[PDB]
Amino acid sequence: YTMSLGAENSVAYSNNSIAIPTNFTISVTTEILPVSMTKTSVDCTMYICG
Amino acid sequence: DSTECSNLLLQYGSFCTQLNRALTGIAVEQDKNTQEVFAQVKQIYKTPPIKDFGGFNFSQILPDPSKPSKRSPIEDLLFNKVTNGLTVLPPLLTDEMIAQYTSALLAGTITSGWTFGAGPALQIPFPMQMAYRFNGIGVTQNVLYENQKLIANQFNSAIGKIQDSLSSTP
Amino acid sequence: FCGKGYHLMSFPQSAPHGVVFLHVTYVPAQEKNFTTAPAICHDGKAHFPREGVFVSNGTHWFVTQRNFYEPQIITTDNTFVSGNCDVVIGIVNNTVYDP
Amino acid sequence: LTGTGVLTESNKKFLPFQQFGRDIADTTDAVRDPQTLEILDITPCSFGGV
Amino acid sequence: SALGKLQDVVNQNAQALNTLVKQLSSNFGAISSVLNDILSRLDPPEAEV
Numbered sequence: 303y304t305m306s307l308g309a310e311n312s313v314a315y316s317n318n319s320i321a322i323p324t325n326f327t328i329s330v331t332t333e334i335l336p337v338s339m340t341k342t343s344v345d346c347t348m349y350i351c352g
Numbered sequence: 353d354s355t356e357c358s359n360l361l362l363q364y365g366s367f368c369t370q371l372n373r374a375l376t377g378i379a380v381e382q383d384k385n386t387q388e389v390f391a392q393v394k395q396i397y398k399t400p401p402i403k404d405f406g407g408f409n410f411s412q413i414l415p416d417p418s419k420p421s422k423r424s425p426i427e428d429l430l431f432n433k434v435t436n437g438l439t440v441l442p443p444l445l446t447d448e449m450i451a452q453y454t455s456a457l458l459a460g461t462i463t464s465g466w467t468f469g470a471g472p473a474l475q476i477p478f479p480m481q482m483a484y485r486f487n488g489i490g491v492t493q494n495v496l497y498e499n500q501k502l503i504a505n506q507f508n509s510a511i512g513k514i515q516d517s518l519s520s521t522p
Numbered sequence: 523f524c525g526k527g528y529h530l531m532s533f534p535q536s537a538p539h540g541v542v543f544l545h546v547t548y549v550p551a552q553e554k555n556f557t558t559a560p561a562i563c564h565d566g567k568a569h570f571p572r573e574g575v576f577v578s579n580g581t582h583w584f585v586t587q588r589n590f591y592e593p594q595i596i597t598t599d600n601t602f603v604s605g606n607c608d609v610v611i612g613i614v615n616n617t618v619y620d621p
Numbered sequence: 622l623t624g625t626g627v628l629t630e631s632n633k634k635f636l637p638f639q640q641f642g643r644d645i646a647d648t649t650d651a652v653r654d655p656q657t658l659e660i661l662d663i664t665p666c667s668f669g670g671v
Numbered sequence: 672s673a674l675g676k677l678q679d680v681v682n683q684n685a686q687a688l689n690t691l692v693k694q695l696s697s698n699f700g701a702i703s704s705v706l707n708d709i710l711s712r713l714d715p716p717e718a719e720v
């Protein structure tokens with residue numbers, strides 16, 4: 303299929319109308335960020351030659 | 353297509369697998385980059401058919417209905433100004449879908465300000481939105497309202513100068 | 523930068539070779555249409571909201587904060603005066619209360 | 622087949638056509654003794670960073 | 672797949688190490704991939720090659 307970018311949302315714009323929220327949601331989201339890698343050391347002489 | 357060459361190449365091990373894996377990682381990283389830049393909204397916002405924004409003109413940045421590529425005149429000028437086992441993989445997002453994403457972002461920031469980036473898109477008149485932006489930089493709303501025709505004219509002139517500067521600089 | 527929505531706070535959590543941020547954000551919800559005006563014309567003077575916005579429920583005009591509906595009577599304490607009514611485009615006539 | 626490693630008694634059971642066993646790096650990690658047919662693991666001698 | 676970002680880093684490091692150890696099994700055009708076989712089978716003038 304051709305992938306849908308998203309749902310269409312025509313904002314009801316006019317020159318004298320505003321939308322004011324009457325309520326709120328306290329939303330908690332996760333963000334995972336890598337920090338470090340495994341500290342690996344390779345003996346070049348022992349790797350190549352044993 | 354030489355079989356003897358590939359038989360000798362197998363003596364070197366999995367170098368070719370490493371190079372193909374690195375190139376595949378680069379190829380998927382480009383699509384991830386395009387997703388991270390352009391696909392920040394899950395709603396495809398559209399401008400109203402009547403372009404009454406209190407004197408503010410966005411025709412040079414809104415998509416042109418007469419063009420089949422559905423690009424803005426600025427974006428059309430930008431696309432005109434950019435010109436043995438090898439393959440070129442096409443990007444996951446084509447240019448018209450990237451233009452549709454930018455059009456959705458433009459419609460959201462014109463009709464709703466910064467509200468669509470923090471939740472539901474809340475409509476607001478564009479001069480009032482500009483006044484809010486004026487208060488963000490520490491200038492009172494009255495200054496914006498009193499000099500609204502001048503601000504709209506300066507904005508339209510600057511957008512036209514942007515198009516002229518892009519069309520006149522190689 | 524710190525989650526989707528208006529950022530309130532964040533909490534860090536350790537992870538194997540990584541960090542997990544629990545971003546606590548404020549999301550607006552249950553929005554309602556209102557008729558808005560840039561300024562209020564009263565006694566030949568233009569009144570602008572000091573921190574909020576002029577809203578109308580259909581018959582009456584109020585001033586409320588921008589991110590939450592909390593309608594209040596348009597007074598001289600939450601508005602400021604700049605110029606007359608001849609300059610601002612879209613100014614409407616409404617009374618301004620004096621405490 | 623020459624090498625250097627710690628020899629331990631092994632739990633692996635070789636098939637009779639098998640003499641040695643190889644690891645990922647194709648080093649002999651298990652061997653059958655050619656006189657008394659028993660299996661021995663060959664763990665390598667300890668390697669350290671000074 | 673919630674913690675996939677850390678798991679990709681761990682998998683890439685383990686895969687790089689695994690491929691590094693797999694490279695020891697290649698002879699790179701020599702008669703054998705084992706040094707001990709070459710030292711036991713050949714005189715030093717061909718063993719140096």
Ligand SMILES: *[C@@H]1O[C@H](CO)[C@@H](O[C@@H]2O[C@H](CO)[C@@H](O)[C@H](O)[C@H]2NC(C)=O)[C@H](O)[C@H]1NC(C)=O
Nearest residue numbers: 312313314315319321322475552553554555556
């Ligand atoms: C604010 O008013 C507008 C227009 O009166 C509403 O937009 C309409 O919404 C209905 C149902 O969602 C649609 O069938 C119409 O096509 C919309 N019209 C336009 C012009 O967009 C909008 O829903 C109202 N907002 C609220 C919060 O009530």
Ligand SMILES: *[C@@H]1O[C@H](CO)[C@@H](O[C@@H]2O[C@H](CO)[C@@H](O)[C@H](O)[C@H]2NC(C)=O)[C@H](O)[C@H]1NC(C)=O
Nearest residue numbers: 323324325326327328329550551552553554591
């Ligand atoms: C704002 O939204 C909250 C939901 O987050 C509403 O709280 C709910 O109210 C209904 C009816 O009063 C209850 O059945 C639910 O149990 C409530 N949920 C919670 C989590 O408390 C609240 O009523 C809304 N307020 C307004 C003014 O719309």
Ligand SMILES: *[C@@H]1O[C@H](CO)[C@@H](O[C@@H]2O[C@H](CO)[C@@H](O)[C@H](O)[C@H]2NC(C)=O)[C@H](O)[C@H]1NC(C)=O
Nearest residue numbers: 403404405407408409410411412425508511512
């Ligand atoms: C917004 O800007 C566009 C372009 O700057 C205006 O379109 C011009 O309109 C005049 C007269 O209508 C024409 O002579 C030009 O050729 C048009 N330019 C282009 C590039 O098409 C437009 O009139 C402005 N105003 C509105 C309300 O759209």
Ligand SMILES: *[C@@H]1O[C@H](CO)[C@@H](O[C@@H]2O[C@H](CO)[C@@H](O)[C@H](O)[C@H]2NC(C)=O)[C@H](O)[C@H]1NC(C)=O
Nearest residue numbers: 556577578579580581582583584592593594595
């Ligand atoms: C707009 O809000 C005002 C104030 O909240 C409403 O005025 C009140 O309406 C109630 C309900 O009929 C009356 O009991 C009060 O006496 C009214 N107060 C005043 C000072 O008149 C008004 O009705 C609202 N308008 C709409 C269309 O909802």
Ligand SMILES: *[C@@H]1O[C@H](CO)[C@@H](O[C@@H]2O[C@H](CO)[C@@H](O)[C@H](O)[C@H]2NC(C)=O)[C@H](O)[C@H]1NC(C)=O
Nearest residue numbers: 563564565566567606607608612613614615616
């Ligand atoms: C808002 O109030 C002003 C002033 O009371 C109104 O302006 C007057 O309008 C009448 C008839 O249109 C004229 O005869 C007066 O000369 C005007 N006075 C001034 C000072 O301009 C205005 O019409 C009102 N507007 C609305 C929408 O109610």
Ligand SMILES: *[C@@H]1O[C@H](CO)[C@@H](O)[C@H](O)[C@H]1NC(C)=O
Nearest residue numbers: 316317318404406611612613
């Ligand atoms: C808003 O548009 C209407 C026409 O739809 C017009 O009558 C009115 O004067 C406009 N108001 C402003 C402030 O531009």
Ligand SMILES: *[C@@H]1O[C@H](CO)[C@@H](O)[C@H](O)[C@H]1NC(C)=O
Nearest residue numbers: 637653654655656657658659
């Ligand atoms: C001699 O070697 C054979 C294997 O070839 C084995 O079966 C036998 O037990 C060995 N005998 C002695 C005395 O080591």
